[PDB]
Amino acid sequence: LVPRGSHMVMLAQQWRDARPKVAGLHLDSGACSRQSFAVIDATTAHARHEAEVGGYVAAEAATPALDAGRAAVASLIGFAASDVVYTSGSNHAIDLLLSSWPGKRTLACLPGEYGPNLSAMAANGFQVRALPVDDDGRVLVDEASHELSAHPVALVHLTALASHRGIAQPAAELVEACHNAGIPVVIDAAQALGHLDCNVGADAVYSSSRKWLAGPRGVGVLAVRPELAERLQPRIPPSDWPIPMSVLEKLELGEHNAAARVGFSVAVGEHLAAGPTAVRERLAEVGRLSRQVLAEVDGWRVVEPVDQPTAITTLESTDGADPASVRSWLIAERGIVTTACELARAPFEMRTPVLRISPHVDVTVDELEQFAAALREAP
Amino acid sequence: RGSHMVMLAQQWRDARPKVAGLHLDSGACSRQSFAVIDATTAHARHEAEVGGYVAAEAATPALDAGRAAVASLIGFAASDVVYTSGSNHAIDLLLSSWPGKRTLACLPGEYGPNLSAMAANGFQVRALPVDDDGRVLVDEASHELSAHPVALVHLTALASHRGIAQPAAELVEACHNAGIPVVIDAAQALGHLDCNVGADAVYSSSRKWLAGPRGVGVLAVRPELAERLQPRIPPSDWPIPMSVLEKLELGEHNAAARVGFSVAVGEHLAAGPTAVRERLAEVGRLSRQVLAEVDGWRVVEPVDQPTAITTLESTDGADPASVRSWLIAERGIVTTACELARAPFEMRTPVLRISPHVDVTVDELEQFAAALREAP
Ligand SMILES: *Cc1c(COP(=O)(O)O)cnc(C)c1O
Ligand SMILES: *Cc1c(COP(=O)(O)O)cnc(C)c1O
């Protein structure tokens, strides 16, 4: 570890300038990022259009934008546009899928599985087994391969990037291992979409608008391969359904904020326009710089290996400080936005809570140093 | 009577974007005021400045004011009120949480997707007695519920497919006398009918008569009932300590739209609920008078129904859906076409629905009547 300087990318500056000026310092795009002026305007415009021509007329007329959003998402995950459906977010997504699941309801997932995912799993009558992982919580693909062949399961649920830790999971290799054992794979890409390469052959993928794609809140996407989709049995309407519609049409049924969905379509568009690979390489870099700058802070140790290709960095207190209090202090006294991850976020992995930073492409080394500095003089 | 001059109507029109053509469809989706649109935009901007959840925390006063306004309209407490994605979200949250024996009675004109949610949640559904208009007969219902009791009564106080105002208050006390709680679907009724009627739970949608943003609804449950409920998510066997209402309000949502909504209900209170409702009743009367004499269409609602919903049944087998498309494409007039699926146990034939808000004029109603005559 001989420190390395930051790459200069105009991407960072373009991205900062495309969105409102931050009041203080925002290191929290893993919780909720920042909508561009274009995304905010497109949302506002739809709401105005609803008033001028009627809400549903407006919605019909927005079909091109909506479909473009499906198509953009589809391209990032290697699906077809018509496999992609809108939701309220990722927890909505997993519930739609698991509540629709036919036959034996068993699955395997990581021990670091997201608390509310486990909640949805249990609530849908699933039996849940842990996959083998190393000390960082990263799946051991070979071991998992053998385990799944001997002791199969109805599906594997992989959270490719966890909310509580910035480890990038070997999604692609695990997918082919599961497919070799004849088991479909669902991916929670709430953190991963717009961040990791999510084109990995999965059978279903879901994600949230408001995180790395910097879309409006209250939107998510769920993508399901046609072979799987047609096997599914939605909860509403009941399977003796007089109205004839496809599974995906049923899963997309319901009042929603249409303006926010067109907002989202603009946001994914901005990601494609910026260059997915370039954005991801930059986020990997942000993580490296973060872990380098924060390597030497009294009372905090960096959890992630330095070279993890993610922008999520988590800090564990070494003298029993409470992340939640530090976050409140950082906001109130320094205007620095972070997230405090409680144990409930990953109850079968986390033994102690952590402070999480999740900066986007626009963060500077100076800003990371300001955070480090503020973290030292915290009471 | 007829051409009442009401300043409310003009203020309401001018507080919102100019309509392109003619909008008679506030029962499907109304029109957000500039203030509501701006408040929504502002929250989204604030999320970008200070962080999404920081912004959400800071918006608590507005959000709580929205709960309090809703509470005042239904005669509940603010802390009984929870936000949802809409009314179908609401009914599902409630029915999926319902403890013990799952039986209910509802109207035959019950909303199709309500029946869907009922069936999906394992409820047995019995019809309430009604007159020829689909309006509940409270005395008969009283006897029926005493003889054959049920876990709850679900009343849609104003239907999507017909502008009959149900005697909610009378039915509520009849059910309470039989010891049976009452849930009210006030998607159409809130901001429209007096919804302060002693119900045990009430829900509604933002985008209709209150002219709020889409993707927001409210669900209100009395504390005695709320604490008996057993939410689906998280599972009841789970460790996380939160109230029932906290559980039902759990989830990613558009926070900006909720503050938008709080502004919208505020505008309703500010305008005077009673005055707005009296004006909507008037709009219905005028609509049915103007449309009384149209070839190929009969008016379904009695003229004096205190609602702004008027429905038209074709007398020579015209298809409402096609007429709606024509009206939009060729005349710029926005209506809704109600298919049988909207009330499958009442509707024998589909209908064209108009649902104008307070701002409609007699002239505009005549233009609609005229356009309806020269429709192919
Ligand atoms: C954000 C998050 C979720 C939940 O997403 P919502 O949009 O809030 O439902 C699930 N998975 C992970 C990894 C998360 O970070
Ligand atoms: C609009 C409507 C609903 C469903 O409302 P959503 O917000 O679309 O869920 C339910 N009841 C009636 C009377 C309706 O008209």
Author numbering:
A (entry chain A): -7 to 371
B (entry chain C): -4 to 371
Reproduce text from the manuscript describing this model.
One of the key steps in the ergothioneine-biosynthesis pathway, the C-S bond cleavage reaction, uses the pyridoxal 5′-phosphate dependent C-S lyase to produce the final product L-ergothioneine. Here, we present the crystallographic structure of the ergothioneine-biosynthesis C-S lyase EgtE from Mycobacterium smegmatis (MsEgtE) represents the first published structure of ergothioneine-biosynthesis C-S lyases in bacteria and shows the effects of active site residues on the enzymatic reaction. EgtE and Egt2 are PLP-dependent C-S lyases in EGT biosynthesis, leading to the conversion from sulfoxide 4 to EGT. Each MsEgtE monomer has 15 α-helices and 11 β-strands and is classified into three domains based on the domain assignments of NcEgt2.
Because of the fast catalytic turnover of the enzyme in the substrate as described in NcEgt2 (32), it is hard to obtain MsEgtE–substrate complex by co-crystallization. A data set to 2.35 Å resolution was collected from a MsEgtE crystal with a short soak in the substrate. We observed an additional oval-shaped electron density in the active site, but it does not match the substrate (sulfoxide 4). Based on the catalytic mechanism of the NcEgt2 enzyme, we found that pyruvate, one of the products in the catalytic reaction, fits well into the electron density map. The complex of MsEgtE-PLP binding to pyruvate is constructed by a homotetramer composed of two homodimers with two PLP cofactors located close to their respective subunits, and pyruvate interacted with the interface of the A/C subunit. In the structure of the MsEgtE-PLP binding pyruvate complex, pyruvate binds in the deep crevice of the active center via extensive interaction with surrounding residues. Specifically, pyruvate forms salt bridges with Arg348 and Arg337, and also binds to Gln183 through a hydrogen bond. Besides, the carboxyl group of pyruvate creates hydrogen bonds with Tyr48′ of another monomer and water molecule. In the α14 of MsEgtE, Arg337 directly interacts with the carboxyl groups of the substrate's cysteine part and forms salt bridges. Tyr48 on α3 of MsEgtE, occupying a spatial position similar to the Phe48 in NcEgt2, participates in pyruvate production with the same function as Arg75 from α3 in NcEgt2.
